[PDB]
C-alpha cells in the first residue's frame, strides 16, 4: 500500500516544517523510540541538539526538494531529499539527507539520527563556527569627502573607585561636569546603574574635540565607531546606524550579531552594500576535535563605498542658511540632475544617536513640534505660488495665454462669481494692468487663477500630465509620487483655480519640484534628479515648448532685476539669476490662524550650472526663503557653471 | 560602395515613416520622375493615390521588417521588405513589398509603382471596401435583467410644411409643446436650424411612454438605439455611449465610423468586449472591376454580453432612498464580495446623453454644485466615525484595548495636553463611564482617540497595514487606492488621534470601505469585492482576529438594539442587524461653516447574507444615512441570506 507511503511523505514534510519554523520540540515528538535500529536519542536530547547546533549557526529557512519515500520491509520505509537553509554564513544548498521511517499501526515516525541535523554527522560529532565581521563601507560626496565613515572616537568615562569618598567625590564630579558640559545628576545616575561595579570604567560622553584637563577619576579611551562629519546638517539624508539586536538577526542571519545596522536614511537604504559579508567557517568535527567536514567557508568581504552627487560644502551651507527653522533646500545641476544638497531643518544629531542617546533627549526630538526627524526634501507639499511658472508654460504651449494680453484687475481679492461664496483668490500687490510678465514679477495669483479658469481643466491637465505626477523616481530615498489632486477630476472651479497657482490638493516634494522646474534650464526637457554619482543621466523630452521657456525665463530674470520683482534683494549679488518666489497658505487645527510657507526657486539662466528650490515651513513673521538664499547662491554660482 | 546602399536603406525607411505618419506628400516627394523605368506617376498623383486608398481603408501604423537593399547596376538598387498595417478590418500582416531605387549623384529616389500601396497592385487597379457593423453587446444584472441594452425607441419630430402658416403654425406648436413637455422656444429653434428644410422630419424628443394625441405636423418614428432601463439610478456605474467621431477613428480604425462608443462608466470600460468586430472585405480589383485579390475578409462578430453582480432592484432602491441628495450606497454579499448595488446621487439621465442633449442641459449637470457626474462609490472620502470599529479590532488584536476597562470622560471635548492648542476631539453624548461597548453604542470619539494614542502609531499602522491601503482592487471602475495618510508617518498626535476615529487624512472610497468592513462577516477574513458575475471569489486571511470579531459584533448589535444606540430607529424593523453610524466633519473655503458627512454601516450578523455602507455627503440639517436605510435593509434581508 502507498496508503502508508502517503503518511510517510507527510511525516517527513511535517518534520521538515517543524524545523523550518524553529519549533524543535514539535520535530522531536515525531521521532521513534531510542533504540539501535530506531532513534539514536530521546526527544529531550533531540530537542537540545537542534536548539544548540541550529542556534549556534543561526539556521533559518529549512526548505526541501526531490522527496522520495520507498519501502524496504513491512515495518520500515526509507526516505531521502535535497535541502537548503540559511545560516550566519549564507545559504547551504544541495544537502543530501536520508533516513528511515517506522510504521506502527496508524503511526509513522522518524528513526532520528544525527545525520538529520547535517548530513555527514554521526555519533557524538560536534559543530564549530568561526567568524570575522566585515568593516562597514563609507558614504562619500561627489569629491570624496566623507559623509558616513568609521572614525576613532575619544570616549570619556569615570572609575567610581578613583573618584573619592564624600569630600573629593562630590567635588570631582563638579570638575568633570563643568569641564565637559555634563549635568552632574547624569554622572551620579550613570555610576549608580545596576551593572556598574566600583572598579569599572563607566562611559559618559564622546569628546568631539581636543581633550582638556582630566580631573580625578575622569579618563579617556579610544573606541572605533561611525562618525558623521557634517553632523546634523545631513542627518535626515545620511541617517545613522545602531546596535544589531537578536530581533534583527532573527530576520536576517547574515548580519553580524556583534555589529551595526542602518536604522534610517541612506545608512539603511544601502545597509547591504555597506555592511559587506561575514567571513568564517562552519564545520563538523568528531568527538575528539578533528575537522571532518567543512560545510561553508569564505573570507570576509568588507563593505563597498557609496559615492553621492552631494557637495558636502553645499549641504552644510544649505543647512546652516535655514538658521534652525523648519524648512528644506534642494540644489542641483539641472542639466544632469545631480543632487548637490538635500537639507532639512530642524535636524537631529546623528552622532548622538549612533553613540547611545539619553532616553529623554530622544523623546525631545520626537515631541518637538517642528519634527526634526522628518526628511522635508522627501515630503509632499503644495508647491506654492512658484507653480505659476508651470501653469504659465502650459498656457503658452496650448495658446490660451497671450503674453501681451493685459488683464484688468482691481484690488487684492477676486472670485469668478457668487457661487464661490465668501471664497476669493488673493494677491499682495494691487496692480491694475497685468500681463504675464507683470504677473510673474509681482507674483500675481489673481492673474494665474483667471488664466487657469480660462484654459480649463482638460487643457491644464493635458499639460500637467506631461510632467512627473504619479511617477516613482529612481532614488534610494523613500517618498510618494507627486499628485495633482486627490482624484482624476477637480470637480471644482475653486480647486482648478487654486491648483493654477500652486495651492489646492497638489503634493510635490522638493526633489520632485526641482525635477519639474528643470525644464527651464533644458529648453523644455525635464531632467530626472540623480543622487548616485556613477548613475547615468535620464531625461524626458518635450515636457514644455522651447518658446514657452524663451518667453518665461526673461520674465524670471525680471523677478530679480526689476525694483518691484519679488526677489529683487538678490539683484545686489551681481550674479545672473532667474528666480520665482512663492507662498502657500495652510490651515491647522491647533493654531487659531493659518500658517504660511515661503518658497524660492532660482537658477543661473546664462550657463544653467545650478538650480535651487528652498522653503521655510510655517514661517515666522518677516522671515522668507529669499532672505536666506544669498550665501548658497553665491557658492553654487561660483563652483557650478 | 555600400556608401550608396546606406542611403538606399535610409530612403526606404524615410519613405516608410512618411506613410506611417500619414504625410503622403512627403512620401511622394521621394519618388523618381515619371517614366517607363522610373516612377509610374507624378507626385501629385501619388499623393492622391495614397490619400484616396489608405483613407478609404483607414490605414494606420505602417511598420516594416526584414529590409534588404542590394544592387543590380551602377544607376539602380533593388529593395524588399515585409510589412504590416492596421485598417478598419484589423491588421494586415506579412505583406511583401519590393521595388527599386534610382541613384543619381547625391540623390537616391524610389521608382514608385502602384505595388507600393498594396503589393499585388498594378496599373489602374482599384480598391474596394465593404463592411457590416457589429451589434453592441448588453450589460445585464445578476439575474439577466438588462442594464444597458438596445431598444426600439419612439422618436417624436415635426415637419415644418405640415405645421402651418401663421394661424395654426403658432397654435400647433402650442399643442405639441404641452402634449409632450417641450418649451415652444426649443421647437421654433429646432425647426429653424441651418440644416432644416421645409419638408424634412425634424426630430425633437424621445417618447419613453405611451404615444398620446398627435397634433398637426407632429409625427412618431421608430429608431434603434441604446436604452438604459434603470435610467439615472445606475448612470454613473453603467455610463453611456456617444456617436463615434473622425477623431475616435483616427485613434482606433477598428471602430465603426457609423457607430457608438462608450464615453463613460462600464460602457467605456468594456467598450471593446461590447462593440464586437466589424465584418467586411477589403479587396483589390482590376480596371474593369473583376476581383483580383482579397486582402482581408471576415464575418461580423456581434458584441458579447457582460453579466454583473448588481441586483437591478437593489440598485434602484439604493438610489431612490437617497432622495436626490448627495450621497452613495454600496451593498454586498460580504462572504463572496458581490456588489449588489453601486448608487451615487445626485445623478444624470444617461438616456438623454446618448440620444442627443441640449447644450444648456449638459452645462446644468456640470455647474450643479452637487456634481452628479461624480461616481461617489469610487471617490475617496474620510471614512468617518464608523472607522472606530476597525481601530477597536486592532486594539483588541494587539492587546492595547481591554473591553472591560472603563475610561472616565468628562464633557464633550478632550485634548491630550496644551500642545494641542485650541484643538479638541469631540463627542455628542456626555457619558462619564465609558468602556468599549459603551463607546460603540454612543459613537464616542473621545474614547477611541484616547485608545489610539495609548496604542501608539507603530501598532496602529501595523494593524492598518493588514487591510488594503495602497492596493489596486481588480475592478473595471476607475479609482485610486485607499490611503491611511499623506505620508508613512503622521508626525502628529492630533492626526494619529483623528485617524483613530476615521477623520484625518484617510481616503477610502465606499467600495474599499465595504471591502474592509467585510472582515466582520468572515471572522477576520477580508473578502475582495467583485462586480463581474463569473469572476472567482478572492480573499485575504487573518486581517483581524476571530476574537476581535466575536467581541465587536455583539456590541454592534447593541448600536441597534439599545435604546441609546445611534442606530436604534432600525430596531423597529425587527430584523437581525449589527450596525455602526458615523460622521465626518469637513471644511470648505466657499462655506462659512463646516460641512458634515453622515454614514451608516450594517449587515446581518446571523447569516452574513448582505452588507451595506451608505453615506450622505454634506448633509442637510436633521438628515442622516440611517434615516434613509430601512427599505434597502428590508429588501436585502429578505433576498440575501
Automatic annotation (TrEMBL), chains A, B:
GO cellular component terms listed in the entry, alphabetical order: plasma membrane
NTF2-like N-terminal transpeptidase domain residues: 9-125
Record keywords: Membrane, Transmembrane, Transmembrane helix
Recorded GO MF terms: penicillin binding; peptidoglycan L,D-transpeptidase activity
The organism's place on the tree of life at top rank: Bacteria
Compartments reported by the entry: Cell membrane
Gene Ontology terms describing biological process: cell wall organization; response to antibiotic
Main subcellular localisation: membrane
Residues of the Penicillin-binding protein dimerisation domain: 132-292
Membrane topology field: Single-pass membrane protein
A Pfam family recorded for this sequence: PBP_dimer
Keyword Acetylation: no
Keyword Membrane: yes
Domain Penicillin-binding protein transpeptidase: 327-627
Family from the record: Belongs to the transpeptidase family.
Name the UniProt record assigns to this protein: Penicillin binding protein 2 prime
Organism name: Enterococcus faecium (strain ATCC BAA-472 / TX0016 / DO)
Lineage: Bacteria, Bacillati, Bacillota, Bacilli, Lactobacillales
